[PDB]
């Protein structure tokens, strides 16, 4: 939703990182806010932004909505 | 944002799951 605020400026973040191998100097090369996440270069925020998802709450209800569907299959 | 959960799940699926899963699959060769 911070990306929704400024879709030109802010880079779309992927999942966060947990390396125990990033010693100190790596972590300064990944901090984007509090997160150290990867930058999601897979076009997903664009498609979810044209769908009409404008929150994280709809993403949680959708994620549960596909855990249910994978349990169905 | 439960920020502590990758510090649990990334090791327990990253390393100890391909230890015990090596045990389950490799003993499962002989079961």
């Amino acid at each position: 939703e911070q990306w929704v605020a400024n879709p030109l400026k802010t880079k779309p973040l992927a999942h966060a990182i947990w390396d125990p191998h990033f010693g100190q100097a790596a972590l300064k090369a990944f901090t984007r806010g509090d997160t150290v996440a990867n930058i999601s270069y897979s076009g997903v925020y664009h498609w979810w932004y044209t769908i009409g998802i404008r929150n994280n709450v709809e993403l949680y209800t959708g994620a549960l909505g596909l855990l249910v569907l994978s349990a169905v299959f | 944002s439960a920020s502590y959960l990758p510090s649990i799940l990334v090791p327990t699926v990253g390393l100890i799951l391909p230890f015990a899963s090596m045990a389950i699959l490799f003993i499962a060769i002989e079961k």
Partner: peptide, 27 residues
């Protein structure tokens, strides 16, 4: 954005994991 929904998520995919091992030990 919260924490409890993450617990609910790993509950639902833990159950889905039980269907994964459940389907896995029949084929």
């Amino acid at each position: 954005i919260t924490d409890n929904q993450v617990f609910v998520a790993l509950i639902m995919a833990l159950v889905c994991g039980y269907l994964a091992v459940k389907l896995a030990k029949q084929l």
